[PDB]
Design a protein around this ligand. Structure first.
Ligand SMILES: [Mg+2]
Lengths: 18, 44, 651, 402, 59, 185, 56
């Protein structure tokens, strides 16, 4: 919905750095 | 009658609290946390 | 840390270049030349320990440049010329020592030193400070010894208060004598200024300045300050002036400042600024409510009536500094007679020498400890709610001795988790509430109206000798019923006595153990308490036995209620800090009886809940962090031991 | 037996947060000479000295100079600070004798009691410092003839894995304990902060782990565990944009065992943004709690604050919950609210107005408070409730005379 | 190649501002009382420092 | 409607009132809205200075009342610091001589007029009632945690770091690296 | 009237004798120099400051 996929958009793009 | 018909009270201020007993627990709000400064000292 | 010379392992066989010296350019030696040996400047070693260049480490031209700039800019009154150079300590290697050469400002002939002026400083030490500051050769003398001489004299005056007595100038210098001249100033003019600030939302305060105060008179401050013409200025004079002017109690702030009067350096002008208090204050806290049937916000005339509270405060009633606070709170101002709340406080700090006088109209709701589960499993709690007026006087005397005299007019109610009154206590038998109870009040309907007198006397002679207090303490309390009104005529008296004695079955500490290694002694504590109640005592004023600050290891009212009672306790305390460990260890035994006076109460609560009349307990404990106690105690009426965690010290 | 899911939704959406950082030893940072405060400089110094230590160990004389200079300042500051301790101890042994200093007793407010009846129990010798702090914890209804405080709250705070004042892992812990012969209360909370990068070595990238536990005997006979892992970074959409994400797990362990019982899982986001003249701070959350026997229950929450340049004194906040109970196709239960505040000064008084809208029951709550520290001109409205009381007195006094 | 080290540049800049404040104080003590132009309130300290432009704007 | 430029300090103080009120602007809305819709080693301590955004704000309450006391060693008095009967202030060397001398003079163990007494609850009624009352009323008049001078302090430090980064970059590329690569041959 | 009043009176009298010792020492200290007398305040100020100290 909104706070499952976009709650993993931030998780994936935080994993994209570290 | 209009004032007393809303027996649910005015909404009260939110605090983080424990589930069982409701004692307050500490918060990390940025507009308060950005003013804080600590240091380190040797012990005796 | 500490002399990095294992980094200079680039020795004479570990690196090679054919025609050039090989290695890294390490500093291997720092030599300081031309530094004066005057006492006001640091010597060569801690001058060496503040340079950017370090021995055994590498460097560059920038380090020498910033060292030269920092040394030239730090001591420009004394040196003002540093030259820094390097030289190789050996061929075919890049190791090189760096030397620092200072040429201080010199003064071309000073043979003698003289001190002139200074009519307050006696001749016994002017001779020794003139003898100390002498150089050896007369011909080329550095400037900085000048700065040594006044660094004696100034310090002497700064050791004796006196912040306006200083070495002015040196007036010799043509006959070879360095002659300091001491200036000693005196008070000439005392003036007072009257200001008040203004309350805005700005961060900077603006003022209204008056030539004369509205209440206080201008010569009163000058007479109170004790500032005379022709006197020296002492800092303790300013402290005494602050105390004596600020004694009046009508001042918010006061600034005392002495200034040099630069037209004449032997004068001092003291200026005083004082502010009165602004005593008036009030606070209004309203709330509204509008019901939206549709977009119209219901703007009828009987809709702007609020439901807030009013607070009005005033200090400085009746000329002296006594203050009053008043509060009303109605939740609906079109029907204020529903749940109207009212509060009044009146305080008087300067009623009498060492005495304050107070009055208050207030509320209290607490839990009754009489109706507790003693031998019956479950019991509904009873709540004591008092509302009313109390007026009292307090004295502190003998640095901690306390006397309080109070007169009380109160309304007392007994409740059960709600605003609903009860008249009897009750228990559950199987699933049913029991019958006819012991009564909770004196009128039998659960509400009482009482007029009472309360006296309290406390005598303390207890002091903490490296922790672990010693001495004795006595407390006395009398309650008297004055109403012929729903309450009865009663007299309820309590006396307690605690002695902290040094342990007699052990060797006693001596003075060097107390003062050098800071050892605390081993103590015993002996405690007694007793109480009596005559007349018609109501159930919210019975004595209750058991709990903390009673026999430990019991519930808070587990031993029965009482009309007369006796309580005894003893304890042995050892400090662990004498063996390096933190905290202190103790062991206790305690006891209490109602002296067979359970039958004496109305309704007999000690047999209704099957509580015993007596109880003894013992245990061990550790006190760790200030006044945090961890006990293991053992009930002896049952035979079970429990751990307890408590704050604060008993006895 | 688990708490309602609105509790979790309120707990996971409470504004834009900010984690715990490194604290610096002031005498070695800015070697010798006095300093000032700045977050980026201290954060730079902490990672800079670990880097220079690694390079100095590897060889590298330029790093060895910097690390040795820091060591020199470290030794000098430490010896100075122990000298200050010795001077303070000698001054205390001069001012008092073998006597100790005694704290103020706690003030509990007025009572119908002589108010120094038990004040001698809260005046104790200091101990000065051991690392932890204690406060007493008080209940709402105390016993009648005694002091109301019952429990003790302990607080500890440290920075364990540092080398020479260049710390690693900020850490703190808080435990409330109330023990007597009947009940047992034991609450606890711990936070651990982990710093991955600071500028100029990266962007500011910090994660935080929180754990908490709840024991309350003999009322509940189950214990409560919560764990929160949440991560923040400054950026991701533009320069200096404070974004963060997080997850939360919770359980009610039956009999104390953390392997059995109902569970709660939730996730949250935060962000700030600046478009036009509008600056907004928003956060949102979704919780997927398990019921006692019913199964999945899910909820959505969101908060927003809209800062505004022009009219810089109007505060306005918006809040939303959505509830999804079983039979989800026709039981979507929404709720949203608005809040506005403003502030004036007039008649020598400071006025503040707050307007609140709940939007389920269409009610507007207005509340104005004032404060006049100058005069009693603000009391002219006090004639409003004083009239009606008279109209409720005579009408009583008529009916009491019939 | 060898610029002035910061912490020294700013320290000497602040001490230079202290020197400027003492300069203004001494010059106002010595020259600030004599009147050059009585119609505008121009004094010798303002006039000899080349600040007559400031005085016209101030009036 | 576009973007406010020209933000001065009065704007910042007005916004700082809102930033203060943010914490009380949060309420326990959610279950109330559901109910209303369903019916239908080292030690870490606080800083020695106060906190961030420092400003030397005012100089008003500079004077305090002292008590002239006796000291735990004999023939010494103290109003702010200890004076040693010749008018001088006492030094480090005199304290140890006085302690070694009062070894003998404390051997009589005379206990009278204790140095730190057990403090009562009603110790200073005037002081706890009204000591800095104008500052509390002045905080009731403006509702800002932070002062504008601390904001100017922090902002100017940040602008200084930004500018200094710009000269570091320009110095690096135009001065240091060409010379360093020339010296590399 | 026979046990509590004289004990408190005796303790208070010891307190004023200690205060007079303090002011005698201050006068002796300022007599050791060539200075003036410390100018103590009167008794009304003494009990009023006993209610309104800032430092002990
Ligand atoms: Mg608790």
């Amino acid at each position: 919905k909104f706070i499952f996929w976009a709650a993993m958009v931030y998780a994936t793009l935080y994993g994209n750095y570290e | 009658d209009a004032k007393a018909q809303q027996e649910p009270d005015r909404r009260s201020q939110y605090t983080r609290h424990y589930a069982f007993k409701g004692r307050g627990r500490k918060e990390f709000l940025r507009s308060d946390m950005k003013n804080d400064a600590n240091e380190l000292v040797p012990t005796r | 840390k500490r002399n990095w010379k294992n980094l200079v392992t680039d020795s004479e066989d570990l690196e090679e270049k054919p025609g050039e010296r090989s290695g890294t350019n390490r500093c291997v030696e720092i030599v300081i030349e031309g530094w004066p040996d005057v006492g006001n400047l640091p010597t060569a070693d801690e001058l060496k320990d503040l340079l950017t260049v370090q021995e055994g480490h590498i460097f560059e031209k920038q380090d020498l440049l910033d060292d030269r700039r920092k040394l030239e800019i730090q001591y420009e009154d004394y040196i003002a010329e540093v030259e820094i150079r390097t030289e190789y300590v050996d061929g075919k290697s890049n190791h090189q020592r760096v030397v620092y050469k200072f040429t201080p400002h010199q003064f071309r002939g000073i043979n003698a030193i003289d001190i002139k002026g200074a009519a307050l400083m006696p001749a016994s030490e002017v001779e020794r400070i003139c003898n100390e500051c002498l150089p050896k050769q007369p011909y080329m003398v550095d400037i900085a010894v000048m700065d040594k001489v006044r660094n004696r004299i100034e310090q002497w005056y700064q050791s004796r208060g006196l912040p306006f007595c200083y070495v002015g100038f040196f007036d010799g210098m043509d006959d070879g004598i360095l002659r300091a001249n001491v200036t000693e100033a005196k008070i000439d003019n005392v003036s007072v200024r009257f200001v008040r600030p203004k309350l805005t939302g700005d961060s900077e305060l603006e003022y209204s300045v008056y030539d004369e105060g509205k209440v206080v008179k201008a010569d009163k401050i000058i007479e109170a300050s004790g500032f005379q013409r022709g006197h020296h200025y002492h800092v303790e004079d300013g402290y005494d002036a602050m105390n004596s002017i600020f004694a009046c109690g009508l001042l918010e702030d006061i600034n005392i400042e002495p200034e040099q009067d630069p037209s004449d350096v032997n004068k001092i002008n003291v200026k005083i600024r004082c502010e009165e208090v602004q005593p008036k204050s009030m606070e209004l806290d309203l709330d509204w409510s509008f019901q939206l049937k549709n977009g119209i916000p219901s703007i009828n005339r009987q809709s702007l009536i609020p439901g807030g509270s009013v607070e009005v405060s005033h200090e400085n009633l009746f000329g002296n500094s006594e203050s009053a606070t008043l509060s009303l709170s109605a939740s609906d101002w079109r029907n204020p007679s529903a749940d109207l709340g009212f509060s009044v406080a009146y305080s008087e700090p300067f009623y009498k020498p060492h005495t304050t006088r107070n009055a208050q109209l207030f509320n209290t709701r607490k839990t009754s400890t009489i109706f507790t589960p003693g031998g019956e499993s479950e019991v509904p709690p009873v709540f004591v709610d008092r509302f009313g007026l109390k007026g009292w006087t307090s004295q502190i005397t003998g640095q901690d001795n306390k006397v309080e005299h109070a007169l009380m007019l109160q309304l007392v109610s007994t409740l059960d988790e709600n605003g609903q009154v009860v008249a009897k206590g009750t228990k559950v038998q199987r699933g049913y509430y029991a019958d006819n109870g012991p009564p909770t009040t004196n009128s039998g309907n659960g509400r009482d109206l009482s007029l009472s007198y309360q006296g309290f006397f406390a005598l303390d002679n207890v002091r903490f000798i490296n922790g672990n207090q010693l001495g004795e303490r006595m407390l006395f309390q009398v309650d008297q019923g004055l109403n012929p009104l729903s309450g009865g005529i009663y007299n309820r008296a309590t006396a307690s006595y605690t002695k902290f004695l040094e342990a007699p079955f052990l060797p006693k500490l001596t003075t060097e153990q107390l003062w050098k290694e800071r050892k605390a002694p081993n103590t015993v504590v002996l405690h007694a308490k007793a109480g009596n109640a005559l007349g018609d005592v109501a159930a919210y004023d019975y004595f209750s036995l058991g709990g903390p600050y009673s026999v430990r290891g019991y519930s808070h009212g587990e031993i029965g209620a009482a009309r007369r009672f006796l309580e005894l306790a003893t304890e042995v305390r050892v400090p662990l800090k004498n063996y390096g460990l933190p905290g202190t260890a103790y062991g206790f035994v305690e006891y209490a009886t109602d002296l067979g006076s359970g039958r004496e109460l109305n309704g007999n609560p000690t047999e209704y809940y099957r509580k015993p009349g007596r109880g003894m307990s013992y245990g061990l404990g550790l006190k760790a962090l200030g006044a945090c106690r961890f006990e293991y105690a053992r009930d002896c009426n049952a035979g079970t031991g429990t751990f307890l965690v408590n704050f604060g010290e008993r006895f | 037996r688990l708490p309602p899911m609105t509790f979790f939704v309120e707990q996971m959406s409470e504004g834009v947060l900010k984690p715990e950082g490194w604290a610096t030893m002031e005498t070695v940072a800015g070697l010798g000479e006095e300093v000032t405060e700045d977050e980026g400089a201290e954060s730079f110094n902490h990672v800079y000295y670990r880097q220079m230590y690694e390079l100095a160990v590897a060889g590298d004389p330029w790093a060895q100079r910097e690390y040795a200079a820091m060591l020199r300042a470290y030794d000098k500051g430490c010896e100075s600070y122990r000298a200050s301790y010795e001077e303070a101890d000698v001054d205390a042994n001069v001012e008092y004798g073998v006597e100790s200093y005694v704290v103020d007793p706690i003030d509990f407010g007025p009572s119908f009691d002589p108010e120094d009846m038990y004040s001698h129990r809260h005046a104790y010798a200091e101990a000065a410092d051991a690392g932890v702090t204690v406060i007493p914890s008080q209940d709402y209804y105390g016993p009648e003839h005694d002091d109301p405080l019952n429990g003790i709250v302990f607080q500890y705070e440290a920075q364990p894995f540092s080398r020479h004042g260049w710390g690693g892992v900020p850490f703190d812990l808080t435990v409330c304990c109330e023990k007597d012969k009947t009940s047992l209360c034991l609450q606890g909370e711990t936070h651990v902060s982990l710093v991955h990068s600071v500028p100029p070595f990266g962007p500011r990238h910090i994660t935080q782990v929180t754990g908490s536990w709840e024991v309350l005997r003999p009322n509940i006979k189950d214990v409560m565990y919560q764990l929160e892992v949440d991560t923040f970074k400054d950026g991701l959409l533009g320069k200096s944009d404070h974004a963060g994400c997080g997850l939360m797990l919770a359980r009610l362990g039956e009999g104390g065992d953390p392997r059995k019982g109902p569970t709660a899982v939730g996730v949250r986001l935060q962000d700030t943004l600046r478009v036009g003249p509008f600056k907004l701070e928003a956060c949102a959350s979704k919780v997927a709690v398990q019921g006692p026997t019913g199964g999945k229950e899910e909820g959505w929450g969101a908060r927003a604050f809209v800062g505004y340049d022009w009219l810089p004194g109007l505060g306005m906040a918006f809040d939303f919950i959505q509830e999804r109970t079983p039979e989800e196709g026709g039981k979507r239960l929404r709720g949203y609210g608005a809040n506005f505040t403003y502030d004036w000064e007039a008649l020598g008084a400071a006025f503040g107005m707050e307007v609140d809208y709940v939007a389920a029951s269409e009610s507007v709550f207005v509340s104005v408070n004032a404060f006049s520290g100058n005069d009693y001109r603000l009391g002219w409205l006090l004639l409003l409730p004083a009239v009606n009381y008279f109209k409720e007195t005579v009408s009583s006094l008529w009916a009491r005379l019939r | 190649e060898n610029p002035m080290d910061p912490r020294i540049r700013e320290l000497m800049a602040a001490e230079g501002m202290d020197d400027k404040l003492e300069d203004e104080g001494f010059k106002d003590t010595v020259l600030g009382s004599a009147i050059i132009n009585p119609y505008t309130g121009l004094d010798m300290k303002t006039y000899l420092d080349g600040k007559e432009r400031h005085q016209a704007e101030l009036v | 409607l576009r973007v406010k430029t020209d933000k001065d300090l009065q704007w910042w103080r007005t916004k700082q009132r809102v930033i203060t009120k943010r914490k009380s602007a949060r309420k326990r809305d959610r279950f109330k809205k559901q109910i209303a819709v369903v019916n239908k080693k080292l030690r870490k301590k606080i800083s020695s200075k106060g906190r961030r955004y420092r400003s030397l704000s005012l100089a008003r309450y500079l004077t305090a009342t002292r008590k002239p006391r006796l000291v735990g060693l004999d023939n010494l008095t103290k109003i702010d610091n200890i004076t040693t009967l010749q008018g001088a202030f006492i030094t480090k060397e005199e304290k140890q001589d006085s302690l070694n001398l009062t070894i003998q003079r404390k051997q009589e163990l005379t206990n009278s007029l204790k140095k730190s007494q057990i403090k009562k609850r009603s110790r200073h009624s005037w002081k706890k009632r009204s000591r800095h009352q104008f500052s509390r009323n002045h905080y009731k008049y403006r509702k800002r945690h932070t002062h504008g001078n601390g904001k100017l302090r922090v902002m100017n430090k940040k602008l200084k770091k930004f500018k200094a980064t710009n000269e570091l970059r320009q110095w690096w590329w135009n001065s240091f690296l060409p010379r360093y690569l020339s010296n590399l041959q | 009237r026979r046990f509590l009043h004289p004990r408190l009176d005796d303790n208070q009298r010891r307190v004023e004798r200690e205060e007079e010792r303090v002011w005698a020492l201050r006068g002796q200290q300022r007599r050791a120099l060539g200075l003036h007398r410390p100018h103590r305040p009167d008794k009304d100020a003494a009990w009023r400051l006993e209610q309104m100290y800032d430092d002990d």
